[PDB]
Design a protein around this nucleic acid. Sequence first.
RNA 1: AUUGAAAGUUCAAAGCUUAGAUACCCUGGAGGGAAACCAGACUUAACAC
Length: 95
Amino acid sequence: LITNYLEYFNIKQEVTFTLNIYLDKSREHKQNFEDKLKFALYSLLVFILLGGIGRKTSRGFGSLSIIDVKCYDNSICKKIEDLAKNFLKISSGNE
RNA sequence: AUUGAAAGUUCAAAGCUUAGAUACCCUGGAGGGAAACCAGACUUAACAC
């Protein structure tokens, strides 16, 4: 009971992680792979911008924030790289 | 009324004897127990005011 109670307080502030994304190229452009993938990368950006990880993300906990994005295949993601660079500096709320 | 008449190719007799469907021969080669999946959802009640 004490272990179960004390583990609950392992809450840290500012957990920082690196999310790598690998891609299987062997899975070809079957019908619409490239656009499906681009839409999925946009969905990932929208997740990083509007959602969080873990429990009760609907109440602010686990809120995510971008620190650095780096593309490695421009032809697929170079419109997500900059569009996420669009969040490394936010002067005011209206912006 | 004929170079005729008469005359059982018959009798006895084991397709038997010896003889190994045996000799050589890998159920082996190839093949990812993987694929997908949020430990998460939410506060409510009571009376006082």
